[PDB]
């Protein structure tokens, strides 16, 4: 499969999440995603085919993981924006106030602004700390997906948000949305990963 940020993958033929970013770990191909999407050794599929397994994760506390892929997978420096792509250029962290977008298999490509940093989310499994908050909307299934600026700087991976009864927060105003991502930089250093850029 071609590995693009925001696309759907399944975990142990059960849950669905979204790809974060193509990365390498030496010769090993991979993608980063959210920790809550799978446990270590869980099997990832795209297009019905096995593409790899969860190599490592931290969740809760953080919400980070990477999936180590078979050598047959094709890593791409891209994030889905409808039928087009945003090119991944780097991982410079944007400041509060910056515009930012996110990509995932439920609500697609959505934009907003970064409204706060170092936010704690309390999930059923425990607290997750250090999250960045934006007001781009999102929904169930968008987890793991890319957060990236329009200029191509990869920010993080979708962790959670204040979804409403319809499964997303796209039906309430931006001012009322809390959409939270796990920062990319600590995932890269934690697992010795390098971002695929183009």
């Amino acid at each position: 499969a071609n590995i693009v940020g925001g696309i759907e993958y399944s975990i142990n033929n059960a849950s669905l999440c979204s790809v974060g970013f193509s990365v390498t770990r030496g010769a090993t191909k991979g993608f980063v995603t959210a920790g809550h999407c799978g446990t270590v050794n869980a099997t990832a599929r795209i297009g019905g085919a096995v593409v790899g397994t969860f190599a490592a994760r931290v969740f809760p506390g953080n919400d980070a993981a990477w999936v180590s892929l078979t050598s047959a997978q094709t890593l791409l420096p891209r994030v889905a924006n409808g039928s087009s792509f945003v090119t991944v250029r780097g991982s410079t962290e944007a400041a509060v106030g910056a515009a930012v977008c996110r990509s995932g298999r439920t609500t697609g490509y959505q934009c907003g602004t970064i409204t706060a940093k170092n936010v704690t989310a309390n999930y059923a499994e425990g607290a997750v700390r250090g999250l960045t908050q934006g007001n781009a909307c999102m929904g169930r299934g968008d987890s793991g997906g890319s957060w990236i600026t329009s200029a191509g700087q990869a920010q993080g991976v979708m962790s959670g948000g204040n979804v409403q009864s319809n499964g997303n927060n796209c039906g309430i105003p931006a001012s009322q949305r809390s959409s939270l991502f796990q920062r990319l930089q600590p995932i890269l250093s934690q697992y010795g990963l390098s971002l695929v850029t183009g």
């Binding site: 309390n122 999930y123 059923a124």
Partner: peptide, 4 residues
């Protein structure tokens, strides 16, 4: 996930 949903913050609670």
């Amino acid at each position: 996930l949903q913050p609670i």
